[PDB]
């Protein structure tokens, strides 16, 4: 497994019951968010760790056909059956780098 | 997707 891209972002999940975003893992702050590629089965996943204490706040697969939504210039999002993930990037450049890596990953799947 |  190899990191193909990384960006700084505050990782959020959507609390549908209350119609609100909450910090992934319980506390607000920036994480280093990677896309990892695993050879052999050709899989990708997003893995993010809090800069402060290395808490893993996101670890989710990227399936073929995932719909990655660039809601704003610095907030991007996607879903699975259980929850909706959001990345609040530290800059538009961080967001564009991550998005381009994600979209190219979806082309390799 | 939900809004921000
Ligand atoms: Br492969």
């Amino acid at each position: 497994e190899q990191s193909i891209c990384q960006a700084r972002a505050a990782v959020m999940v959507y609390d549908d019951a209350n119609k609100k975003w909450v910090p992934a893992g319980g506390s607000t702050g920036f994480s280093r968010v990677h896309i990892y590629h695993h050879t052999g089965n050709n899989t990708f996943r997003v893995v993010g760790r809090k800069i402060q204490d290395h808490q893993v706040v996101i670890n989710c697969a990227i399936p073929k056909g995932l719909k990655y939504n660039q809601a704003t210039q610095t907030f991007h999002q996607w879903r699975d059956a259980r929850q909706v993930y959001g990345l609040n990037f530290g800059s538009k450049e961080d967001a564009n780098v991550f998005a381009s890596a994600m979209m190219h990953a979806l082309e390799v799947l | 997707x939900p809004p921000x």
Side-chain angles (χ1 to χ4, degrees), chain A residues 14 21 77 84, chain B:
Chain A
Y14 192 70
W21 293 90
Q77 61 191 158
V84 182

Side-chain angles (χ1 to χ4, degrees), chain A residues 37-43 108:
Chain A
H37 180 245
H38 186 76
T39 63
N41 292 16
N42 189 40
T43 56
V108 168

